[PDB]
């Protein structure tokens, strides 16, 4: 058990793994989001990538999850969005299937997170006023 | 005492000072990292600078030191990297010499910091479940 090397899985290897198994390697995917007319096209692509990254970071920050990869929140889970329990979500499903399932219940959750964070900010300011 | 102006050392002139004195004016260096074919070259340079700043910020955030200039962490200091005591580091050395000395033990520290931050996040999530 000395002198033997180890090589770990790559970029999207955990795409077929379960949600719980694939949630332990978020950094491997996170680190890869950043890095005459042909030069124009390349610069446009780079600027678009930077804009997408900044948009995602702003969306994360507005919910109060700035600088976090796993950040749980205060919004309760409505049963109408999905009835399945934890056993058949984090152990018998993958992220692609989950995205396909709840693709139509996304914006409302974002709005709920935004208003919840705003209320939390106002309450924190009121508490700090004392 | 009154009617006398004052000016202070600005840019990298504080590089010859010891580490203890050099780590006291981080903001002056930090603030300066951001700000037809010739237009292409200038735009490429600007995009490269923005990309480098974003990479540095992402690397800082992944370790949990987001939005901080001094952020001391939980990883213990292995003695194999350097055996000098704090007396001979923060009062008898400069940042350039220290960087030259520990240039070959940098990546492993970054990986340890990443793994430690991931473990801390998972432990915090487990604690919050109660």
């Amino acid at each position, epitope marked *: 058990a000395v*002198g*033997i*090397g*180890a*090589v*770990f*899985l790559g970029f999207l*290897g*955990a795409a077929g793994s379960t949600m719980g*198994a694939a949630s*332990m*390697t978020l950094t*491997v995917q996170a680190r890869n989001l950043l890095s005459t007319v042909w030069g124009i096209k390349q610069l446009q692509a780079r600027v678009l990538a930077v804009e997408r990254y900044l948009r995602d970071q702003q969306l994360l920050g507005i919910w109060g999850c700035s600088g976090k990869l796993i950040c749980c929140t205060n919004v309760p889970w409505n049963s109408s969005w999905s009835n399945r329990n934890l056993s058949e979500i984090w152990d018998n499903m993958t992220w692609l299937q989950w995205d396909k399932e709840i693709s139509n219940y996304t914006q409302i959750i974002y709005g709920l997170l935004e208003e919840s964070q705003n209320q939390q900010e106002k309450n924190e300011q009121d508490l700090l006023a004392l | 005492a009154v009617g006398i102006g004052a000016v202070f050392l600005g840019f990298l002139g504080a590089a010859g000072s010891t580490m203890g004195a050099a780590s006291m004016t981080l903001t002056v260096q930090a603030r300066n990292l951001l700000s037809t074919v010739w237009g292409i070259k200038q735009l490429q340079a600007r995009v490269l600078a923005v990309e480098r700043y974003l990479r540095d910020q992402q690397l800082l955030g992944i370790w949990g030191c987001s939005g901080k200039l001094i952020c001391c962490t939980n990883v213990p200091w292995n003695s194999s990297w350097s055996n000098r005591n704090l007396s001979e580091i923060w009062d008898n050395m400069t940042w350039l010499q220290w960087d030259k000395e520990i240039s*070959n*033990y940098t*990546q*492993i520290i970054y990986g340890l910091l990443e793994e430690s931050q991931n473990q801390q996040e998972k432990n915090e999530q487990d604690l919050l479940a109660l």
Partner: nanobody, 127 residues
Framework: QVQLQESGPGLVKPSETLSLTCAVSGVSISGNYYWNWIRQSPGKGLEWIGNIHGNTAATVYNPSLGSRVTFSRDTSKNQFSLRLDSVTAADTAVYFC???????????????????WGQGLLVTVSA
């Protein structure tokens, strides 16, 4: 596929320095791999010289050979070199450059094991 090929002078004189260089293809030497040097001679059989860590440049040597063993690694050329000082008649052997490592997942099970044991080269010691 990963391949290893050795190179260097086949004949060396006593008390001189024997330099060998192993070049790898199909994988980089800057990753988490330990590159090992082994030799086989008549009677003695397989014998381990030492190894070098590509990423950190941490080296381990056989205590039997003492300080006569040195290792270096060139990332630009994707090679690693072994240096044997004060070579004697006992060092005539066929030298191989090898590497052993296991491919697994991150906090999970193991997928596969890998060793290659390149061709090697015969080296004789005489003036």
């Amino acid at each position: 596929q990963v391949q290893l090929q050795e190179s260097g002078p086949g004949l060396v004189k006593p008390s001189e320095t024997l330099s060998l260089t192993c070049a790898v293809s199909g994988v980089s030497i800057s990753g988490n791999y330990y590159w090992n040097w082994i030799r086989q001679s008549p009677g003695k059989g397989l014998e381990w010289i030492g190894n070098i860590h590509g990423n950190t440049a941490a080296t381990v040597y056989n205590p039997s050979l003492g300080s006569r063993v040195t290792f270096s690694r060139d990332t630009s050329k994707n090679q690693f070199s072994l240096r044997l000082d004060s070579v004697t008649a006992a060092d005539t052997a066929v030298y191989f450059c090898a590497t052993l490592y296991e491919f697994r997942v991150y906090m999970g099970e193991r997928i596969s094991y890998h060793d290659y044991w390149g061709q090697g080269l015969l080296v004789t010691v005489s003036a």
